[PDB]
Amino acid sequence: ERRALKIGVNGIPVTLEPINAISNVGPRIVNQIFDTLVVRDFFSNGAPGNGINLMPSLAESWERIDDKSVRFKLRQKVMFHDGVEMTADDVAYTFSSERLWGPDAIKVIPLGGSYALDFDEPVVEDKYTVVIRTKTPTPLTESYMASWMGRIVPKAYYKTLGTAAFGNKPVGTGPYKFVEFVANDRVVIEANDAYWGLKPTASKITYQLVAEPATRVAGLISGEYDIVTTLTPDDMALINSYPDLETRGNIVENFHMFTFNMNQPVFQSKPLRRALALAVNRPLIVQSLWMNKATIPNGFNFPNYGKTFDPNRRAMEYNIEEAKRLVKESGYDGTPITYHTMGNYYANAVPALMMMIEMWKQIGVTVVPKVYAPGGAPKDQDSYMRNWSNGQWMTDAWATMICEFGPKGQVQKRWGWKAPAEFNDLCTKVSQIPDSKERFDAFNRLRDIFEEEAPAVILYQPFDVYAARKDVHWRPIS
Ligand SMILES: O=P(O)(O[C@@H]1[C@@H](O)[C@H](O)[C@@H](CO)O[C@@H]1O)O[C@@H]1[C@@H](O)[C@H](O)[C@@H](CO)O[C@@H]1O
């Protein structure tokens, strides 16, 4: 009745510590090991999978007390996988200064600071009651707890081991418990029948790295895998021609992009970055490799932002005439520039890059592909152009414009983007004021500056496709 599931995946996270595993490949695993206080109802308000009403999970109930404080009443007798009961101390530790948003915490969870709300120290009222607090007002606390930043960790065990060692031997409250993790190869988790919620329906799940998508499709066809991830619309006809298999595709709240190491002199200033941005013919790429199913957004602007989504925003421009003009003004001598990609970790990463190489050749820029295997990533000093993605993880434009591209983020700090002062002042301003005409117009100014500066270039939202045996009725692939 309960089968062992074998999942062929595009990649394996570098760790299983829930925040440091935030990526396209970590959530599908950590989502089964850990739980959150609340969860989004993906089908609320008639939504076809992207609904936002919040429902109980580790917290049975919650009340916003004021514009800075939310009280959570926790479920009782919830057990971590090692048999330690979960209490308000564990939830307080999860969002503490020590673990997440303090100065020392940023050394081991490098992105904790940039992805945190403006937290103050949680208050434990009793064994099953915790108050999550912010130093300044924010309405996002509750939805933040349903996000990939809100997975609850065990205080005693986590603090003893440290963030890094915990990541190799994680302990959570989720429906599956950790078995093994082999870097760049597999993760195995097993049913936790002590789970507080619905009993797990699989006995074990193995996430196995299968780098090439054609090999994943072939493994599903042979019965080696029950489920496979990160396919494209082109694979659908063949898979659906098998009566015992099926595919599922949808536009994800994530965008593919290319970006630059702006510590490098060739990309320290905007002209050549913007030239490469203006030479990208996105409809051609979408028509050639995505069967016109991938979506091109009107800027760094997505419907899930709600009040900060601008449905009337103009399209991102394509101007080869201006791109040629900016290549010359930059003094670009013709030196080849590398573009690093971990194979097709991103669906259509290598075929899209080859099309963009030809587009860039037509504006006088020579770009060379540098394709590497998992774990063979280059040092920052050797990275020039690279591909990336950003999952739009909040119902507010704060994510990912401010958490990734703002003054506290990795694009400015690690990757050297010298953002104009107006950009960083606007990031600061929006994080103070509530939803209004002022906030809506400020995010539009940030979007305008993003396109002028080109620290990254948005390509499209992929039409994500996965496949599975029709007799596998539960697929832990998030
Ligand atoms: O798999 P990727 O695209 O990017 C991951 C990186 O996170 C990871 O460090 C790198 C090396 O292992 O491999 C991938 O490029 O995940 C991004 C996050 O990096 C990002 O924080 C989030 C929100 O913006 O969106 C996505 O989930």
Side-chain angles (χ1 to χ4, degrees), residues 194-211:
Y195 186 61
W196 60 263
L198 301 192
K199 282 270 178 289
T201 61
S203 59
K204 156 181 82 169
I205 310 160
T206 298
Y207 296 88
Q208 173 62 61
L209 165 83
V210 184

Side-chain angles (χ1 to χ4, degrees), residues 14-21 30 33-34 80-82 93-94 99 109 151-173 178 181:
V14 298
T15 183
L16 298 175
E17 194 287 338
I19 295 171
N20 293 341
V30 305
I33 300 170
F34 300 94
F80 281 104
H81 301 147
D82 63 356
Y93 179 75
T94 297
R99 188 257 176 170
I109 297 183
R151 293 177 164 123
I152 303 303
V153 304
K155 175 185 188 185
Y157 177 83
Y158 187 114
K159 187 165 176 169
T160 293
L161 261 67
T163 298
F166 176 87
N168 293 329
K169 200 148 179 63
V171 166
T173 63
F178 180 75
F181 166 43

